[PDB]
Design an enzyme around this catalytic site. Sequence first.
Site, PDB file in Angstrom:
ATOM      1  N   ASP A 144       0.823  -1.210   0.000  1.00  0.00           N
ATOM      2  CA  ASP A 144       0.000   0.000   0.000  1.00  0.00           C
ATOM      3  C   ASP A 144       0.856   1.257   0.000  1.00  0.00           C
ATOM      4  OD1 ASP A 144      -1.800   2.042   0.421  1.00  0.00           O
ATOM      5  OD2 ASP A 144      -2.985   1.002   1.924  1.00  0.00           O
ATOM      6  N   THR A 145       1.188   1.771  -1.190  1.00  0.00           N
ATOM      7  CA  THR A 145       2.041   2.954  -1.268  1.00  0.00           C
ATOM      8  C   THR A 145       1.363   4.185  -0.664  1.00  0.00           C
ATOM      9  OG1 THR A 145       1.286   3.444  -3.523  1.00  0.00           O
ATOM     10  CG2 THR A 145       3.309   2.186  -3.311  1.00  0.00           C
ATOM     11  N   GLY A 146       0.050   4.108  -0.452  1.00  0.00           N
ATOM     12  CA  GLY A 146      -0.690   5.235   0.100  1.00  0.00           C
ATOM     13  C   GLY A 146      -0.736   5.224   1.620  1.00  0.00           C
TER      14      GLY A 146
END
EC number: 3.4.23.16
Lengths: 99, 99
Positions: B25-27
Amino acid sequence: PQITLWKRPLVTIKIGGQLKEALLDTGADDTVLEEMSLPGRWKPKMIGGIGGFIKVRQYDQILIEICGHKAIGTVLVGPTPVNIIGRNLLTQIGCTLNF
Amino acid sequence: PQITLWKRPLVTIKIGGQLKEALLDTGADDTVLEEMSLPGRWKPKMIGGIGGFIKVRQYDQILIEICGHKAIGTVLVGPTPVNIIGRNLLTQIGCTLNF
Ligand SMILES: COc1ccc(S(=O)(=O)N(CC(C)C)C[C@@H](O)[C@H](Cc2ccccc2)n2cc(CNC(=O)c3ccc(CNC(=O)OC(C)(C)C)cc3)nn2)cc1
């Protein structure tokens, strides 16, 4: 290009004629932007997140430029605390994860 | 390896001796896992998301194996609806975004 994750993967987007910043969010199926002035029609929507749900407007076939790469696809508008570029548009720009 | 985003970037993790699945999850600044049996001490915490806030437990220097790559770092535990691997651990495994 390539982008490392020591910082938030924030990029510049252009949508509805306006310039904004947004998060490259591999954990988002969908693209969700803060309340903005988007032209046109839209159908009501609910989306889930950590913390619970928000109601959003779903606009389809919206053109959006993401860090120089154009895409057309669904953009959900609503009370998200952060502009989020989700997989529906990340795929369109050839974005991948590598490790 | 390389991973495209036409599907959810779900990987296998091992943590606390247990096998689980989680989202790359890069967010997410932080790593947040559903309620699990983790050994040790922990300090109380709040984290924000779409939809509002959740209370979580913060364990530090936790060993976790992510798709074969080991990392040690903070893992937050709580009522997240999805197991999430955040940038604090993505950086440790050399994960990057490319487009
Ligand atoms: C159907 O389509 C979709 C459905 C759901 C989503 S989603 O909800 O946005 N989503 C999946 C979700 C179920 C975990 C994508 C994910 O990446 C979002 C991202 C996110 C991040 C922030 C707010 C909302 C959503 N996310 C990350 C986190 C973990 N917390 C932080 O990183 C984290 C990071 C920073 C802070 C606070 N730090 C700070 O100083 O400032 C900020 C508020 C700017 C972060 C708190 C938590 N919690 N939610 C997307 C599309």
